[PDB]
Each structure stands twice: as C-alpha cells, then as structure tokens.
UniProtKB/Swiss-Prot annotation, chain A:
The gene is GRK6. The active site is at D289. PANTHER family: G PROTEIN-COUPLED RECEPTOR KINASE 6, G PROTEIN-COUPLED RECEPTOR KINASE/RIBOSOMAL PROTEIN S6 KINASE. It catalyses: [G-protein-coupled receptor] + ATP = [G-protein-coupled receptor]-phosphate + ADP + H(+). Its EC number is 2.7.11.16. GO terms for molecular function: ATP binding; beta-adrenergic receptor kinase activity; G protein-coupled receptor kinase activity. It comes from Homo sapiens (Human). One of its GO terms (biological process) is Wnt signaling pathway. Belongs to the protein kinase superfamily. AGC Ser/Thr protein kinase family. GPRK subfamily. This is G protein-coupled receptor kinase 6. It is a lipid-anchor. It comes from the Eukaryota. Pfam families: Pkinase, RGS.
Length: 492, 495
C-alpha cells in the first residue's frame, strides 16, 4: 500500500521468513561452492562471516583479499605489496596457509616475485585456497547458522515481483515494443530503468522468441560493461525488464552535440566496450549491434553495452549465419552472408573507435544500402590528421576486411586488442574493477492465449540473483537487517 | 591443555556446534515459554532480540522493562514513573499494547494510579502481555534463527564438565567430606568456590542420600540470597559442587572479631532482611532450611549475604509436615527439641536467634565461651523467655521476641502471611524490599579484600549426582563474563 528513498514500510517488506519455510528451498538448491560462496554476493558475504569465526578460515580470506588488492595495485607499488603478502602468509616460521600446501610451490612464488611482480604469481595458491575452502569449510558453513541466514535471503529473493514492488517515474525514451522509464524499488530505494514490451505488439509482430532471447542473455551476463537485468516481471498489459539505470545519454548523442572526441576520451570508451565484448564473448555471446547509439553512459561517465535484441549464443565449436545489424556497422563476412562466430563485433569496435575520432562513420555519411556495402567489402577507410598513428593503427587492424587477420580474431581474443599500444596508458585490471575515473562526466539530467500464457511464465521469472543480492548490499539493507544480537541486548 | 582470566583458547572452548548437532536437542526440549523466554537468562535475551525485529513485539518488551523499573522505583518518584508508562503505552490515541486488551482494565489502571502508585497496578497488564507473548510470538520465535542460536547455546551448556573445565586455586576451608577451595572457569574467567566431597568418606559414612539431597536442593533454588550451584561433576576421587564464591567471611567471624561482640542495629537489620529474603525464596520452593546460624551465612565481596550449607535442608511436600530433631543445639526451635512435627516455623525461630545474637553479641539460650549442657539449653529453649538489654531498641526487641515466640502457631512468619509478616515489621520501616531483592541497596559494611592465588550402587549414585552445568547459573555466567555478547553477535565480522 503506497504513499534514502526506501519506503517507511521497508523493514516489513523484507521481513525474514520462518526457518521451516526455507526447507523445501534448502533441498531445492544446488550444492555448489563457487555459486553459493563466491558468485552470489550475499552468499559470499555470509560465507565470509562464517570464516571470521575461525582463525584458520579467516587467514585464507585475508590472503584472498590480499591477492585481489595486489592484482589491481599500480605497477610501481606492486612489488612491495606482494612482498608484504609473502612475509604475512608464506613465512617459513608462520602457520601454513592451507593444509598440505606444496612447499616447492611456495619457493617458486618467493623467487618469481623477486624477479617480476606479474599479477599471476599467486594464482596457484589462490586456486589451492579456494580448493581447500570448497570442501570442509563449505560443509561446515552449510551446517551453520550463517547458511540458515542465507536461505532466508534466498527466500526473499525468490518472492513474486509485481508492479507493486516498484514506484514508476517519468518516461526516459521509446522502444520498438514499448516505453522505457525510470523506476525505483520500494524496499531499497535503488533506481533502475524499466523497459516495457507490450504483450499486444509482441503477439502482433510475433517477437516472442526474440524478446525471450534478449532476457535470457541479459540474465546470464554479469558484466560491469553490460546493462544488467535485475528483475523480469509481467503487468496485465506488458513484460518488463528492470535494468541498470543509464542516465548520461548514449554515444550517438555525445559525439554529435558539439563532432568527435579527444583521443584520451575515445580510447577510454573503446577500452570499456572492449571489456564488455570480452565479457560477452566469454559467455559465447556475439552482440552484433555495436554502434554508438547502443552504448549508454551512467552518471559518472562509465559506459555499458545496451540493447541486446540482436545478440545470440554461439554453441561450442559451431558458427552461425545471418545478415543482421545496422547497415554502416556490419562487417564484410556479415554483408556477404558468410558464417561467423565473434569477428563482427571487433569490426564494429573499429567503426565505433573510428567514428569517435573522425566524427563520422567509416562507410556511411546518406548513401544507399548497396554502395555502403560495396565500400565495406572492397574499399579502405580513409584517415585524416585527426588520428595519431596508433589510433589509425588499431582502427585499421580492427577494420581489417578478412576476419581471419582482424585484431581480436587472430587467436588471442580480447587480449590482442587490449595489448595494442594505443592503450599503453591504461591499467585493465583497474578499469575492469571500475577504479579509473573517466575523462568526461555528464550533466545531472533530472528525474521525477495458452501459447502466450506459457510464454509469459517462461519470461517473468522475477528477481535475478546476482543483481538482486547486489542491490541489497549497495542500499545497506543487507547490513542493517542481516546483523543479529545487538537489538535487545543492552539490559532493561 | 593448560598454561579477563579467560584462557587464550576461550573462543575454541566455546565454539558453537553444527545446527544438525542440535536436532535431537530440539526435540528433547520442553516447549515451555516461561522457561525458554523468561527464566533461562540466555533464552530470555534471544527472545528479546527476536522481539526487537518487530515493532509490536518490541513495545511489549519495552512495557515489561517499564514495569520492572517502576517496581523498584523509590516511593517519591514512583507516581511520575507510572504516569510516564501510561502516557507511553496506554494512550487512548496510541496503539493497543496487545490484542484485545480489555479497555475497562486500562481505565481501572489509570485511576488506581491517580490515587496510589502501589507496585501491583500493572500486574494484570503484565500478565496479559506474557499471555500474548507466550502464544504466537513464541511460535514464531521457535521457528526463527534466534532459537537456532538458543539451541547452539544450550548444546554448549550440556557438554561434559570435568576437572579440565577449571583451574584450581588455594584451599578456602575444610568441610566434613572434603575441602573447599577457590576455582575459576577457563572459558569465561569466572571465579567460584569448589566444595569437594571425597567418594571414600561418603561411602564410609554412607552420606549418599544426604549429599545428593544437598545438591538437588541447591540446583532447584535460584536466589540472590542462597548460594548457587553452577556445576556438579566428578573427579576420580570426588564429587564436586561449584558454588557462588563467598569471600567476605561468615557472620560468626564478623560478630566476634571486635573484642566487643555485636553490630549496630542498622547493620544487624540489613542482614536480617537479606536472610529473610533467602528464607522466603527457600520456603516458596517448599524447603525448610533447618540449620540457620551465624556460621552458615556467608558474605561476598560487597557485603551481601547468602545462606550456605544446605545439608540439613529438606523439601516439605504440599500439605504434609515433617519430623526430626536436627540442627545446632542453641538455634533449634521448641517444636524441634520436643520432636514435634513442623513445616517452616523452625526457620523463623532461628532468624530470631540470629538477629538476637547479632545485636546482643550472644546467642539467646547458649553462651559464647563456657557452654551449657544440651539438656539445660533445651529446657531454657522450651520454658524460659530470652533476656533483653538496653542494647535493643524497642522495635528490635519487638521483632526478636515475636520471632522467638515459643508456640509456632503464634510466631511471626507462621501466623499465615509467611515472610511478608516478617518483612512488614516496623524495624524494617526504612528498607525497600523490592530494591533489596534486586540487589540495589548498598550494604552498610564492606569486608576486607582477602587474597586468592597459588561399586555398581556407587557408580549409579555418581551418575545421578554429576549432572554437569546448571542452566540458569551457567547461562548467567556466560552473560556476566560477556562471552555471550561477544560470541552471540553475528554479521559484523567479515562484512
Ligand atoms: N538502462 C537504461 N537507462 C536509461 N535509459 C535507457 C535505458 N535503456 C534504454 N533507455 C532509453 O530508452 C530508449 C529506447 O530503448 P532501446 O532499448 O534503445 O530500444 P528497444 O526498446 O531495445 N527496441 P529497438 O531500439 O528498436 O531495438 C533508448 O534510446 C534510451 O534513451
Ligand atoms: N561458597 C563458598 N565460598 C567461599 N567459601 C566457602 C563456600 N562454601 C564453603 N566455604 C568454605 O569452606 C568451609 C567448609 O564448608 P562447609 O559448607 O562449611 O562444610 P560441610 O562439608 O558442608 N560440613 P558442615 O558445614 O559441618 O555441615 C566453610 O567454612 C568456608 O570456609
Ligand atoms: Mg533503441
Ligand atoms: Mg562446615
């Protein structure tokens, strides 16, 4: 019933269930350490809290934190940082970090650091730590009170989502199947965007398989550089996708409201999109609609890949076929209706980097579909003195016409691209963990039927675990409601 | 493995069990709210923490705390205090304190207070509040994470107790079956006394039934005025009772260590009041003590007393009487020396002796130094009025004489109103018994800080005796030492 953005009723909305009510749920869940204790953000935090009870488990976690921090530590400070780690967790007089740690392994480590503080050094130890944690600490965790607490959060996570989970605000823009508008979760105060697809227009244009595809892709992907789906639910008129709120406008807007960007800036965006594409390809997803309009900015000026309607899964070992995408941005293979896995995407990245610098698309101004397609297949892109050599270098290697020889497709994937000298200045680990400030910060822009029922049920699955659990942690609902034994403890 | 007093290993000694380990224990335990959520100190706290999650449950607890506070509030401040409670929990515009509270009840309360802030005013509301808490909140609690936590605490409570649970320190004194010495719990740092009974001497003197009786009485009683039994366990040589440590000496020592034996009234009166409370607590459990004398009242560090040495105590079944000349010669009542039957009247007579002796510096029917033969003492007990001096104010003499009344039917404490008869004597005019009862009045004397440092039958009996930790003292121990608060808390550690 309606009226830091949180409802006055939030504590009730998130009131925990009884323990008994979480029993089916226990037996229903998959017994997988990696998911329960690393991926699910709340599972991770509760497992950590379990570990904090025991000194041996707690030094493992401290060590894992030690590494994660060392991995994103600037190149100049990184040797001392790793020196600190060994002195504190690998001392020949200290306690063994984990049972039966191979002691040659530790000697490799010691001396591999002494010559080269590369960010891999602690990989084997990391992997043996998780290995250890995964067995007995895990079994104990499951039989601890901390897992009861986890089941209680999981139960909340799986509760029905309806329109009454949210407040709606103003329309943000219009999309082929409905509007997109700003919304806010009542329990937590967290803002999102909400894309509506009207059941009428889906059924009329029969875009069921395609709308379902966009949703399933969005939920499987978990990337700082791709818009996340937090929730998927139905109204009486529509299917909704609640998504990361990207309020800084897209790149088409930003290139052209002057046209073009200083190198530093264009490079920063290319690096982030490159990560987004890495994250996507890791999940075996080819995006296929990379263009400036589909890259949105957030309030701090980081970007994300948006609109995944044309994306598709590429099964292991196979290729797929299909001319789809926008005319000026489609790669040679695609326009020739040849078979591909991932190459189209790296071609688009080139166009997009090109267009960011040139203030213009490399094969389109408008010119007729035919002639643009001929230029794409047969004609070299033209550079001006707006491109430093390295910019031109990367661009042409990405806008290479043969996909076999195109950067990002020669065998090393995203790392090929990342290693181009144009990015010499940027630390990808830090970029990937969101620790590098963007060059540009946008303007704070204001806010204030059996078939079909079968399809709607497959679609409207409700809360998505990782973003949902994240939402709870970010808004501090987790911290405030999770705690225990502080409230009626101070006597009368 | 040995080396604020807590062992460095304390966190591992108290490490919680797995939840599955608590399952039989769940089903084993009796589903009783009063015990689980009021008497067991840790169950009470966890139930309160459960309540804190829900505003309606938490107002009830606030109310109960409100009343508890009002009950111990000095006479002058008590009306204001109660006006405050009404305004905050019975407002005609406020939310209902509990479902279906009868509104006439509330009107009676409002206006009763308005004319007399008596300490019972909120009793019907209190009762109704527990009544409400004991059904649905209680069922929810049971099915909450907070009970899981209770079960883990209970499991720790029921773990085996051995000599390795404690450190032993110097001998304190020597008892008929063994020594008594100071000990300390390794996990918590809490000090106790430890009374050893040697299996040899018990078997030789056959004092099995009596040693078991003392132990079972000690563990049933729960009084700020009686020594508590916190643990009972066995050694290879002995049976042990771990007891509240009373280090301030006994009253026989304190009465006679002057040169000029006796206490100023205030002081004697304070002790009488505390002993009187301990006797009420015993009698409410249907226990007649039967060995009240000055040597059996111990003082603690702060100078509060407790009744000690319950070997002659006995449970008096409902409606029946008991028989038996037991006790010490000059403190036994007329009934008892005539081998007549009694329930509780012997104890009030002893209180009379004890008060008399505190003031007179002499027992009323036996002498300090040169002692009178059993038979004569017994004659003076039966037949001769005790003698007063100008050392007794009129009211002291009044109380003493009413307690040392020879016919137990007319003796104060036994006319029908029990301890309350005694408590209402004018001699206690100045003392607030609710406060006394909750430990809030400072004693007039604080003792010297006195140092501390350094077979099938039988095995069946040993098993009946060595039951380990006693719940309420145990859970209290965990709270006072702050092991409960530190270990119980959750979701702060790797957050
Ligand atoms: N996460 C978001 N945050 C803020 N605004 C958004 C978000 N997603 C979409 N929008 C806005 O909504 C507009 C239309 O949505 P968009 O997703 O681009 O199209 P669509 O609904 O996927 N169908 P189509 O555009 O034909 O493929 C965009 O131009 C954006 O301005
Ligand atoms: N709770 C305690 N705290 C400190 N000292 C105590 C405690 N209980 C007993 N003692 C000391 O141990 C002595 C002997 O204990 P006590 O309970 O007097 O003997 P007993 O074995 O019960 N036999 P009796 O007392 O003659 O019936 C007491 O006088 C005190 O010196
Ligand atoms: Mg669009
Ligand atoms: Mg003794």
């Amino acid at each position: 019933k309606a009226r830091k953005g949180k409802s006055k009723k939030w504590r009730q909305m998130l009131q925990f269930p009884h323990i008994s009510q979480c029993e089916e749920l226990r037996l229903s869940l998959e017994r997988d350490y990696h998911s329960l204790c690393e991926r699910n953000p709340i599972g991770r935090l509760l497992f950590r809290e379990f570990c904090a009870t025991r000194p041996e488990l707690s030094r493992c976690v401290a060590f894992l934190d030690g590494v994660a921090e060392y991995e994103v530590t600037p190149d100049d400070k990184r040797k001392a940082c790793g020196r600190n780690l060994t002195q504190n967790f690998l001392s020949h007089t200290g306690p063994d970090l984990i049972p039966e740690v191979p002691r040659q392994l530790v000697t490799n480590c010691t001396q591999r650091l002494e010559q080269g503080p590369c960010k891999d050094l602690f990989q084997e130890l990391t992997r043996l730590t998780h290995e250890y944690l995964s067995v007995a600490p895990f079994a104990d965790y499951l039989d601890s009170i901390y897992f009861n607490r986890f089941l209680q959060w999981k139960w909340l996570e799986r509760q029905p989502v309806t329109k009454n989970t949210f407040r709606q605000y103003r329309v943000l823009g219009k999309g082929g199947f409905g509007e997109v508008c700003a919304c806010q979760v009542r329990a937590t105060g967290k803002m999102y965007a909400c894309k509506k697809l009207e059941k009428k227009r889906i059924k009329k244009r029969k875009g069921e398989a395609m709308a379902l595809n966009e949703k399933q892709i969005l939920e499987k992907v978990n990337s700082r550089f791709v818009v996340s789906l937090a929730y998927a639910y139905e109204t009486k008129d529509a299917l909704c996708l609640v998504l990361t709120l990207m309020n800084g406008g897209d790149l088409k807007f930003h290139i052209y409201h002057m046209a073009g960007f200083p190198e530093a800036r264009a490079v920063f965006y290319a690096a982030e999109i490159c990560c987004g594409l890495e994250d996507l390809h890791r999940e075996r997803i080819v995006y296929r609609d990379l263009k400036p309009e589909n890259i949105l900015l957030d309030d701090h000026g980081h970007i994300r890949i948006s609109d995944l309607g044309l994306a598709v899964h590429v099964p292991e070992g196979q290729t797929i076929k299909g001319r789809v995408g926008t005319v000026g941005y489609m790669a040679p293979e695609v326009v020739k209706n040849e078979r591909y896995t991932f190459s189209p995407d790296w071609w688009a990245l080139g166009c997009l980097l090109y267009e960011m610098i040139a203030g213009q698309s490399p094969f389109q101004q408008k010119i007729k579909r035919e002639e643009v397609e001929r230029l794409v297949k047969e004609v070299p892109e033209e550079y001006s003195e707006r491109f430093s050599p390295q910019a031109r270098s990367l661009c042409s290697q990405l806008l290479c016409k043969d996909p076999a020889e195109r950067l990002g497709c020669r065998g090393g994937s995203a790392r090929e691209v990342k290693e181009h000298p144009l990015f010499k200045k940027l630390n990808f680990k830090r970029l990937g963990a969101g620790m590098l400030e963007p060059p540009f910060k946008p303007d704070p822009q204001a806010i204030y039927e059996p078939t079909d029922q079968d399809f709607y049920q497959k679609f409207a699955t409700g809360s998505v675990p990782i973003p949902w659990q994240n939402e709870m942690v970010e808004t501090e609902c987790f911290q405030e409601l999770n705690v225990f034994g502080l409230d009626g403890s101070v006597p009368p």
